[PDB]
Short mmCIF file of C-alpha atoms in Angstrom, two decimals:
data_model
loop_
_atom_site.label_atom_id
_atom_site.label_comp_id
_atom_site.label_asym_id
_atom_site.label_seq_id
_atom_site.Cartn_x
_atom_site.Cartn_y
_atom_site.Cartn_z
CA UNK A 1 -226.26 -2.90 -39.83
CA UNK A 2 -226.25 -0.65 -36.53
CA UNK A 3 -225.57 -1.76 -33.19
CA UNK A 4 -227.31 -0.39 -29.19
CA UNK A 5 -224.89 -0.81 -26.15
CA UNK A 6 -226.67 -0.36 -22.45
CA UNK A 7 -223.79 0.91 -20.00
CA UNK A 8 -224.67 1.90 -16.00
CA UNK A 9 -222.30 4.16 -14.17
CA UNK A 10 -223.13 3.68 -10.54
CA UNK A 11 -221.66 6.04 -8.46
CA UNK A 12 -221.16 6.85 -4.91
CA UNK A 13 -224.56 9.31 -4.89
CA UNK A 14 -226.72 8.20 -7.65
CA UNK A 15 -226.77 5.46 -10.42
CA UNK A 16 -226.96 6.60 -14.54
CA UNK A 17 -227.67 4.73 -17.68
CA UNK A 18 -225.97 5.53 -20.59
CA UNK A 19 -228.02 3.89 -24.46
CA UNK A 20 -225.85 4.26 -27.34
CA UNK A 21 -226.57 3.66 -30.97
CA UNK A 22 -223.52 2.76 -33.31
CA UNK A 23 -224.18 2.85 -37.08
CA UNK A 24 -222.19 0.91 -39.45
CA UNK A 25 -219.26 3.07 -39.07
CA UNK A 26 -219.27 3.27 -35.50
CA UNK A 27 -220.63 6.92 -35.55
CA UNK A 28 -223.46 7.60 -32.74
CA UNK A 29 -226.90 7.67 -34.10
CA UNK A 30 -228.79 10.24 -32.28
CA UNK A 31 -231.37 9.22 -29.95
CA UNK A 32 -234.25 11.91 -29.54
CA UNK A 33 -232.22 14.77 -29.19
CA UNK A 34 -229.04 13.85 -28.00
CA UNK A 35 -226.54 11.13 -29.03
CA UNK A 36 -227.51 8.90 -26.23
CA UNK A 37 -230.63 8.33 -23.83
CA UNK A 38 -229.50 8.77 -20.41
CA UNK A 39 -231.29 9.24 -17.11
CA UNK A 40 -230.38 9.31 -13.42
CA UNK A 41 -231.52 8.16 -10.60
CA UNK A 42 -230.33 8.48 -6.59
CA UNK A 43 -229.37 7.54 -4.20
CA UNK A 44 -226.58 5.18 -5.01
CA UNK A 45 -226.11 1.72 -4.62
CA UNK A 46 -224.36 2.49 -1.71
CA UNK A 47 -227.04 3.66 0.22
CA UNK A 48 -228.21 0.15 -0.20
CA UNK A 49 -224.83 -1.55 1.57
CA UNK A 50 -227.43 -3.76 4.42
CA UNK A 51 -229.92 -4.92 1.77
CA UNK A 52 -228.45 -6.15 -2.02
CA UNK A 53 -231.13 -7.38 -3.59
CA UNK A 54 -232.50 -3.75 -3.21
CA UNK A 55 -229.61 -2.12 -4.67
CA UNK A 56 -230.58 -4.22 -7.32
CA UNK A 57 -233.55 -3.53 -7.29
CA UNK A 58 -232.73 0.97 -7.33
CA UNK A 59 -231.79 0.19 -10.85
CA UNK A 60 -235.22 -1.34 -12.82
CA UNK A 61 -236.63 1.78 -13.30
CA UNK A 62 -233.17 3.26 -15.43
CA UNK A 63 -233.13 -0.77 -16.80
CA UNK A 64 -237.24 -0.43 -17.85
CA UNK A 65 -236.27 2.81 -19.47
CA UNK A 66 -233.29 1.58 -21.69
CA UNK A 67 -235.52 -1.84 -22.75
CA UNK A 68 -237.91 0.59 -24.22
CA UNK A 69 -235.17 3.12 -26.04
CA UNK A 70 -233.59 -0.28 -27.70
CA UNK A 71 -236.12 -2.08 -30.07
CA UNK A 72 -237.05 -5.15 -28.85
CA UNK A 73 -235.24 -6.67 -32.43
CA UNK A 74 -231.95 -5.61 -30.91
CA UNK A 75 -232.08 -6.95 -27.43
CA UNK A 76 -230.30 -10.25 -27.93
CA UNK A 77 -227.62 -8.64 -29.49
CA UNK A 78 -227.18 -5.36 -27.07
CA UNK A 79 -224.17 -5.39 -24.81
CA UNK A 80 -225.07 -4.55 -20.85
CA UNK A 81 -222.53 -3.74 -18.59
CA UNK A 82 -222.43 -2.05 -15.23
CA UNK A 83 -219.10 -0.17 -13.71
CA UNK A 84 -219.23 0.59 -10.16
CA UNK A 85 -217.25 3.68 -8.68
CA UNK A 86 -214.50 4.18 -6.46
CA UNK A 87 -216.45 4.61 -3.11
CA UNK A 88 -218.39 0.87 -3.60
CA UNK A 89 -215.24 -0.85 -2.21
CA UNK A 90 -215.04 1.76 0.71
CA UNK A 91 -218.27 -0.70 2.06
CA UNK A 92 -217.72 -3.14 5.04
CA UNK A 93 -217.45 -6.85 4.24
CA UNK A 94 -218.19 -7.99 1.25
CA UNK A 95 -221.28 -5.37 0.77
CA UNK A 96 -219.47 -4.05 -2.48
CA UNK A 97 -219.53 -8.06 -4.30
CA UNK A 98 -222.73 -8.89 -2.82
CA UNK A 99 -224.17 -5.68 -4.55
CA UNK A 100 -222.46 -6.66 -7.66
CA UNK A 101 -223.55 -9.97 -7.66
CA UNK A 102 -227.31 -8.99 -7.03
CA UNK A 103 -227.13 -6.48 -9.95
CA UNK A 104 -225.75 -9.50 -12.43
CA UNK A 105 -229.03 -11.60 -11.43
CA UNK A 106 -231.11 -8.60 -11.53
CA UNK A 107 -230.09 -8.24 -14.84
CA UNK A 108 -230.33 -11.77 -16.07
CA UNK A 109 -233.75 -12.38 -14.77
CA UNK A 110 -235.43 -8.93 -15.85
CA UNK A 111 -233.23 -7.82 -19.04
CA UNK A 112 -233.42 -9.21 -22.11
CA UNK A 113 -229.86 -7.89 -23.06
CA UNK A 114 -226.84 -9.48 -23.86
CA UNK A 115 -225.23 -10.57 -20.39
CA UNK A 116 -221.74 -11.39 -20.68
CA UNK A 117 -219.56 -12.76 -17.54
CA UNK A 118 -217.63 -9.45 -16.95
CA UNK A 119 -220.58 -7.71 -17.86
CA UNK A 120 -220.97 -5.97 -14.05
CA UNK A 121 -217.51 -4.73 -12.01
CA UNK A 122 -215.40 -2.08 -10.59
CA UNK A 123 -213.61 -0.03 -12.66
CA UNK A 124 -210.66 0.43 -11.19
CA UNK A 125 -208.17 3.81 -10.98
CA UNK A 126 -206.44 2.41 -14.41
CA UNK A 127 -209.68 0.93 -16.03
CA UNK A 128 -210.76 4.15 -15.74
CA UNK A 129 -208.21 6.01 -17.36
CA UNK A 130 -207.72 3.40 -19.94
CA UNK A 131 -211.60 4.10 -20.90
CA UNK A 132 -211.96 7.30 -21.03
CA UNK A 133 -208.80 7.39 -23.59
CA UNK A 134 -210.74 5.56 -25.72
CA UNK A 135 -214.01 8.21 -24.86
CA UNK A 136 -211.70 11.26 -25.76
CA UNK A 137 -210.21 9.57 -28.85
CA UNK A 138 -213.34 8.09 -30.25
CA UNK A 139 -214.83 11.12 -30.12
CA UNK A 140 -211.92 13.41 -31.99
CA UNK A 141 -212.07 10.23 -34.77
CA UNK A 142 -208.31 9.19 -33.93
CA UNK A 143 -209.35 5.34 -33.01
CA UNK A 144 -206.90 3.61 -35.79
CA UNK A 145 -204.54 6.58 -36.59
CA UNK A 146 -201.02 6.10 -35.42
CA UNK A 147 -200.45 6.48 -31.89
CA UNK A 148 -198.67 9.67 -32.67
CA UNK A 149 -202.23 11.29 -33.47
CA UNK A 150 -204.10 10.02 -30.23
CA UNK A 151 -204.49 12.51 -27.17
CA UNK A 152 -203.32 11.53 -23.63
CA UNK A 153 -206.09 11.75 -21.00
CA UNK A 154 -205.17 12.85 -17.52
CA UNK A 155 -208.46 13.02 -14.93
CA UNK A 156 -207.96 14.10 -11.72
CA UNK A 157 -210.96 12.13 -9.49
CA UNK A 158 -211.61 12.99 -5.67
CA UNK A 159 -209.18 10.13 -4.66
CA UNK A 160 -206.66 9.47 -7.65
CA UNK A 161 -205.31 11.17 -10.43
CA UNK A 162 -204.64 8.95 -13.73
CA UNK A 163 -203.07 9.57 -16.59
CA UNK A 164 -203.03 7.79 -19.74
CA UNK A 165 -201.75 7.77 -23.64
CA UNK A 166 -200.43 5.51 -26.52
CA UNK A 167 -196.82 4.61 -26.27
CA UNK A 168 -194.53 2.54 -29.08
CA UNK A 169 -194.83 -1.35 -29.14
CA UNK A 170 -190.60 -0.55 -28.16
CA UNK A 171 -191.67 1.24 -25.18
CA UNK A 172 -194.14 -1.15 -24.09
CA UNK A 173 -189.29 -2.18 -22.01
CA UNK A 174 -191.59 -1.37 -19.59
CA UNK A 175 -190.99 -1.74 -16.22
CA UNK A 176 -192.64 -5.55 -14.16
CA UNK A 177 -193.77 -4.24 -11.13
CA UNK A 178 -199.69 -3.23 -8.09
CA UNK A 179 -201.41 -2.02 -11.61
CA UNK A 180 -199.34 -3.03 -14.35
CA UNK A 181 -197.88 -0.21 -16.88
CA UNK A 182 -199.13 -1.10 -20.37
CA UNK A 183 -202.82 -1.74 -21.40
CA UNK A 184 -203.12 -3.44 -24.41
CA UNK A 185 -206.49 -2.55 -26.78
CA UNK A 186 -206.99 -3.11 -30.52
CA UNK A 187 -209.56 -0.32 -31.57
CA UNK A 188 -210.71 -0.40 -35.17
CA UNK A 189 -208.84 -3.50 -35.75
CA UNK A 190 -205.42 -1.50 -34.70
CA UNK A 191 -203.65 -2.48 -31.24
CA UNK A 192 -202.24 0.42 -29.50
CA UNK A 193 -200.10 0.08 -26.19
CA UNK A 194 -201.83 2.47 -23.12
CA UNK A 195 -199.37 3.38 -20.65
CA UNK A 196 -201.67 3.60 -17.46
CA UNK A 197 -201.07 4.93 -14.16
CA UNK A 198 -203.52 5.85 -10.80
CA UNK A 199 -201.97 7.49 -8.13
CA UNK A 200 -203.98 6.91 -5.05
CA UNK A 201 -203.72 10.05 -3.06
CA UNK A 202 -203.75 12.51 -5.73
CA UNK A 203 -207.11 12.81 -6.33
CA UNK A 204 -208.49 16.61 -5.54
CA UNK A 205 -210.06 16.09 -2.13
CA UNK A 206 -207.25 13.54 -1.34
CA UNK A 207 -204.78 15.71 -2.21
CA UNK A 208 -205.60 18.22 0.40
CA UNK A 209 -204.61 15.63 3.05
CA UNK A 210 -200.97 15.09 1.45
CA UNK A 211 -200.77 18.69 1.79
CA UNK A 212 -201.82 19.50 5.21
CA UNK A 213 -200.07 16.75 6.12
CA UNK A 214 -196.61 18.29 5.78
CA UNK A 215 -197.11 20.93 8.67
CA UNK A 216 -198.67 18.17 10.91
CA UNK A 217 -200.31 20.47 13.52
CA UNK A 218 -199.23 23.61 12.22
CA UNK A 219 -200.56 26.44 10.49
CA UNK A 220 -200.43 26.14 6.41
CA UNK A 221 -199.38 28.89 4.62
CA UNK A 222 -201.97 26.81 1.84
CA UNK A 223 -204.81 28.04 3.67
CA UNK A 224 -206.42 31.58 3.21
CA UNK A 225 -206.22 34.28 6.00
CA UNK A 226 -209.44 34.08 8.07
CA UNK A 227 -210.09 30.04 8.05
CA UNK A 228 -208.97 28.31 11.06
CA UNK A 229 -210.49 24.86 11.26
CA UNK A 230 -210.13 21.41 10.35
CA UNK A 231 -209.95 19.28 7.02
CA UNK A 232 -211.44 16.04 6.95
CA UNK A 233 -210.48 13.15 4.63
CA UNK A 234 -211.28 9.47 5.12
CA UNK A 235 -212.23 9.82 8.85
CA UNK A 236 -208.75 11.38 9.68
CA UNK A 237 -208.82 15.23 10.61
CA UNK A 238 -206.12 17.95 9.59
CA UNK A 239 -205.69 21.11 11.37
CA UNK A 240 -206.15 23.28 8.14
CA UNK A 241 -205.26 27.35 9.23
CA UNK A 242 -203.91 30.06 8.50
CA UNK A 243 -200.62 31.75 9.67
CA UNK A 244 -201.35 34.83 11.17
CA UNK A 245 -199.94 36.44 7.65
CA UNK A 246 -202.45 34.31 5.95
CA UNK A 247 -201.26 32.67 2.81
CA UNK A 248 -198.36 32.46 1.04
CA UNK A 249 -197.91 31.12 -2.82
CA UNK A 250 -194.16 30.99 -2.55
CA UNK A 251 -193.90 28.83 0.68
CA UNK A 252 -197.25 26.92 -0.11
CA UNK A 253 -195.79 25.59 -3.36
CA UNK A 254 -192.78 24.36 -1.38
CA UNK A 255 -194.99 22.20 0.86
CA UNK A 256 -196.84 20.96 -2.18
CA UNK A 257 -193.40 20.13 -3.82
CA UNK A 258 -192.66 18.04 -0.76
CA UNK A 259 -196.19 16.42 -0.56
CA UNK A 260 -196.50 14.97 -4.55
CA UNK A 261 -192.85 13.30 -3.56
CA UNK A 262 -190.39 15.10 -6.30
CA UNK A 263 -187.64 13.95 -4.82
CA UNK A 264 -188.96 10.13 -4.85
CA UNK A 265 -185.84 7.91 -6.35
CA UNK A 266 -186.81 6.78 -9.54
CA UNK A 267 -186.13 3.03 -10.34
CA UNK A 268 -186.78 3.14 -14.08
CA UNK A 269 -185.23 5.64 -16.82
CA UNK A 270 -187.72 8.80 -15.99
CA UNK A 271 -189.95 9.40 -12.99
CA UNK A 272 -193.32 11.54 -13.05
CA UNK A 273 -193.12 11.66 -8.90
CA UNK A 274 -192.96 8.80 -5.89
CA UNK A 275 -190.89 6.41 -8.19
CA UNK A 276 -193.28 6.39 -10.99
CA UNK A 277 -192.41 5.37 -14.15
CA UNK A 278 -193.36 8.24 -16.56
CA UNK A 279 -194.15 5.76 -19.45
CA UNK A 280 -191.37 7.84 -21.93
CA UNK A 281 -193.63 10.84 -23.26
CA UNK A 282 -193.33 11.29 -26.75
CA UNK A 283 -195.96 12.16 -29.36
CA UNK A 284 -198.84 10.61 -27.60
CA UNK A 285 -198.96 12.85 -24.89
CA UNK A 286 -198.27 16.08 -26.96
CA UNK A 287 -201.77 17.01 -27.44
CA UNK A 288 -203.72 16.57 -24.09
CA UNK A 289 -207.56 16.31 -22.20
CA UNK A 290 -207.80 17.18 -18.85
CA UNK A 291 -210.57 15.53 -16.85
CA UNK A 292 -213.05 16.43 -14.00
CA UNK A 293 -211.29 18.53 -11.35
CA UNK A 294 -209.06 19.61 -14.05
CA UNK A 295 -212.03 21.63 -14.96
CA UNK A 296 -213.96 22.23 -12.11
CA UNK A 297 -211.80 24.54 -10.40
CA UNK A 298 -211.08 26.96 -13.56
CA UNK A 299 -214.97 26.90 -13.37
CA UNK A 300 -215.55 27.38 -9.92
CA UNK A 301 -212.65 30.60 -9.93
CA UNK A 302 -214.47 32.48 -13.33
CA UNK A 303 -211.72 30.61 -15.78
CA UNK A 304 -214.30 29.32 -18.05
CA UNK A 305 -217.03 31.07 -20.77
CA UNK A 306 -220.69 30.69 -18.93
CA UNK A 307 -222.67 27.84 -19.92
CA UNK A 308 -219.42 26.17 -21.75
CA UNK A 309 -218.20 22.42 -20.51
CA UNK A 310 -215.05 22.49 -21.54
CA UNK A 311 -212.21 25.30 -22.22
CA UNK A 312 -208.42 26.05 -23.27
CA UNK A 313 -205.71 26.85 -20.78
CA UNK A 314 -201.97 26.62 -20.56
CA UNK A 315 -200.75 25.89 -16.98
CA UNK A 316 -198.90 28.99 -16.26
CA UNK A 317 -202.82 30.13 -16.69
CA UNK A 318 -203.32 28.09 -12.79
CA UNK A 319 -200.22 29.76 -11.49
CA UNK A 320 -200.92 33.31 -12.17
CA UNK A 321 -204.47 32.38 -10.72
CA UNK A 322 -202.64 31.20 -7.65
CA UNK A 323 -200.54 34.29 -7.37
CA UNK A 324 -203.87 36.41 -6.76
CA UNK A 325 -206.30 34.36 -5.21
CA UNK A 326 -203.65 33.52 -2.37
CA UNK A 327 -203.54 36.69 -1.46
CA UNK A 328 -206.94 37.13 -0.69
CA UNK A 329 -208.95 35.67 2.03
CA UNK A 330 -212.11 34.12 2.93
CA UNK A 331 -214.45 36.65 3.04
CA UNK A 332 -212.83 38.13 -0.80
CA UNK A 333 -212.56 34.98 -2.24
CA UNK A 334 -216.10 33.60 -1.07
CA UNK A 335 -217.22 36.99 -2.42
CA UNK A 336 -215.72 36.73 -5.72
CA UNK A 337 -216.33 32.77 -6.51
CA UNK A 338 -220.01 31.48 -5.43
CA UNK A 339 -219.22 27.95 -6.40
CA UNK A 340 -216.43 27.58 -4.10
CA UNK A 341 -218.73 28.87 -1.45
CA UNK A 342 -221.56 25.79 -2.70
CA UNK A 343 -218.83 23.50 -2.40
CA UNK A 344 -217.75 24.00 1.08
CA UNK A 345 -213.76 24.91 -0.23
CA UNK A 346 -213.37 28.48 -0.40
CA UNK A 347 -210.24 28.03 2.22
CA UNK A 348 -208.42 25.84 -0.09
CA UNK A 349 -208.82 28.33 -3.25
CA UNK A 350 -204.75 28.62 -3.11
CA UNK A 351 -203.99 25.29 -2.21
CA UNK A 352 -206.32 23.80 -5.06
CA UNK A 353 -204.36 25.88 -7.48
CA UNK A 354 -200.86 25.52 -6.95
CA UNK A 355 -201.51 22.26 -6.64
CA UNK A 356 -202.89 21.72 -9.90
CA UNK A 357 -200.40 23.92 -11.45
CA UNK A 358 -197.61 21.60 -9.22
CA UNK A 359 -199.01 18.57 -11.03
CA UNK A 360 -199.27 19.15 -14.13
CA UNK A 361 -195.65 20.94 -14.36
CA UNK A 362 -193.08 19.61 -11.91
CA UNK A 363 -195.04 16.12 -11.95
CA UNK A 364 -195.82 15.36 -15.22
CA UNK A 365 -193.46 17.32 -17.08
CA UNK A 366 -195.69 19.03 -19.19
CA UNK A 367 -194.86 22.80 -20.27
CA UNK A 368 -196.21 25.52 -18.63
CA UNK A 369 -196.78 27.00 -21.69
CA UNK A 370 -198.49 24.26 -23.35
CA UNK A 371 -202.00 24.68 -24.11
CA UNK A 372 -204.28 21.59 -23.24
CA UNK A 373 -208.33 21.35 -22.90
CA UNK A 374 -209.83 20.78 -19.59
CA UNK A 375 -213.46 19.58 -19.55
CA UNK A 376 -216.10 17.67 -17.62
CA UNK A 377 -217.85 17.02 -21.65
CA UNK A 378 -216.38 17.09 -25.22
CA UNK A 379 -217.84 17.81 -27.96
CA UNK A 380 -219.42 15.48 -30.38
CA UNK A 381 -221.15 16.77 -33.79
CA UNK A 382 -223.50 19.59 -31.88
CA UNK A 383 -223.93 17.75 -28.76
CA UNK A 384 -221.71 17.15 -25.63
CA UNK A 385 -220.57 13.97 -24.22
CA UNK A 386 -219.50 13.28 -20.73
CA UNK A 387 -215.18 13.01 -20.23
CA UNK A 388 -215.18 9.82 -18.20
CA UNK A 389 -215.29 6.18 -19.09
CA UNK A 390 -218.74 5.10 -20.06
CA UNK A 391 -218.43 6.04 -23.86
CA UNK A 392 -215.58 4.36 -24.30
CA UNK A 393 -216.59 1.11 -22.34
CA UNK A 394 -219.58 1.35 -24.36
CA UNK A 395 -217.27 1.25 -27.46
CA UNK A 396 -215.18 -1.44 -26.56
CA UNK A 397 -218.10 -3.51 -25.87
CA UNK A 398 -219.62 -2.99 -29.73
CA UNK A 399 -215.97 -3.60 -31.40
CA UNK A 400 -216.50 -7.24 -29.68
CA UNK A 401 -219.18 -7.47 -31.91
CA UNK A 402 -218.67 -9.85 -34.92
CA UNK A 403 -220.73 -7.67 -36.87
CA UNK A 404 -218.20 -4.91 -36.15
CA UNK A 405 -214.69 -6.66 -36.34
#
């Protein structure tokens, strides 16, 4: 009658374990408290790039922990699977499939759980997105509705920014091309067609290295008055200061203008930015969840109710933002927003912003008036679930099931 799925997120500083319970309906059964068991544990299996077999070994204790949550009845039948981060293939060699491949016989000679062949992997930059589309929609109860009534996903990560929503089966005239356009998942018994894209380099932290990029060795007008230092992203350094006026929200939105690639000629009827197809718009990507960064910086400048995971914001909401925090400098904005100050990226308050703003408007067409939710959780019944891809890897995994088809 009910189904248990085991999913591991193992990311770049720790590992997690995610145990859901599906009902006959596919709605979460609550475990303890909460609508899943999950537990963490660190460091990463990254930390274990010389020795596999111990990275393997980092993950028994969360593995011990979800063979006792599932009754020992349901073990045959429970779906494992394992999705590795973005960082893994940053590793030398072949560290990253070594690790996999130790986790796989890790899990086949300790779990009792259902081990299928693509049960352990990366998830890559459109893998990603195309999950946690199915998290956001299987949590608002949209999986078999018309794709007119699902909600595009956008999450900007620390390397990439993806976006993803249902298009027409007319519309998936799409473009051959790399990661292909169109994703193709039945959910509830009804196929939908995903447009998917990643765009490496527009991540958050990535992003900041497009931008500074523009002046080369210059000052940024991007960067707040009293920083005068240097940016580092994947080993390369950027000069990242200040002009002697400090910064400057008019000129630093022309640089970011120039570093998403507007002007990029677009092969295909409509472009998002740097030739990208922008898979049509339409209906599916009128109603819209922001991921990750998309939140944490309206948390980290005071956008956000305390204690609340997700909130409500139009983008015009990031510009006006923009047009007071870059006049400010260090010392003010440091003052005013603790978090930023935690996370090492009080000079880039400005930058961050208009650059989010920059995205979401001039890159993905979206209104600057539109409201969308940003959120690092959604809600689900009282509880919260996380906005990235394990739920909805987790989901796809039980629909498999014959008992659930």
């Amino acid at each position: 009658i009910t189904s248990y799925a085991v999913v591991f997120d193992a990311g770049s500083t720790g590992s997690r374990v995610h145990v859901y319970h599906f009902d006959q309906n596919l709605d979460l059964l609550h475990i303890g408290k909460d609508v899943e068991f999950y537990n963490k544990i660190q460091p990463g299996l990254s930390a274990y790039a010389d020795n596999p077999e111990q990275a393997a070994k980092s993950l028994i204790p969360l593995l011990e922990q979800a063979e006792n949550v599932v009754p020992e009845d349901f073990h045959s039948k429970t779906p494992i699977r394992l999705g590795a981060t973005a960082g893994l293939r940053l590793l030398d060699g072949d560290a990253s499939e070594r690790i996999l491949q130790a986790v796989r016989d890790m899990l086949n000679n300790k779990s009792t759980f259902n081990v299928q062949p693509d049960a352990v992997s990366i998830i890559d930059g459109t893998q990603e997105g195309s999950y946690l589309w199915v998290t956001i929609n299987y949590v608002l109860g949209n999986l078999g509705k018309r794709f007119t009534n699902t909600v595009g996903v956008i999450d900007l990560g620390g390397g990439s920014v993806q976006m993803a929503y249902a298009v027409s089966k007319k519309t998936a005239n799409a473009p051959k091309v790399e990661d292909p356009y169109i994703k193709k998942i039945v959910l509830k018994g009804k196929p939908y067609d995903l447009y998917v894209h990643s765009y490496l380099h527009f991540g958050r932290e990535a992003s900041r290295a497009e931008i500074l990029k523009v002046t080369h060795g210059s000052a940024s007008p991007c960067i707040l008055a009293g920083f005068d230092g240097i940016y580092t992203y994947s080993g390369e350094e950027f000069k990242a200061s200040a002009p002697t006026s400090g910064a400057n929200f008019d000129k630093c939105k022309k640089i970011i203008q120039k570093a998403l690639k507007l002007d990029y000629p677009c092969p295909y009827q409509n472009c998002t930015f740097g030739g990208i197809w922008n898979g049509g718009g339409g209906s599916g990507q009128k109603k819209l969840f922001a991921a990750s960064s998309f939140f944490y910086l309206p948390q980290d400048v005071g956008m956000v109710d305390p204690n609340k995971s997700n909130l409500k914001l139009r983008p015009v909401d990031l510009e006006n933002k923009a047009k007071i925090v870059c006049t400010l400098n260090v010392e003010d904005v440091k003052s005013a927003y603790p978090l930023l100050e935690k996370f090492n990226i009080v000079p880039y308050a400005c930058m961050d912003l208009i650059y989010q703003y920059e995205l979401l408007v001039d890159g993905f067409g979206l209104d600057p008036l539109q409201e969308i939710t940003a959120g690092e959780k959604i809600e689900y019944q009282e509880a919260l679930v996380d906005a990235a891809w394990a739920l909805g890897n987790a989901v796809e995994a039980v629909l498999l099931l014959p008992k659930f088809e």
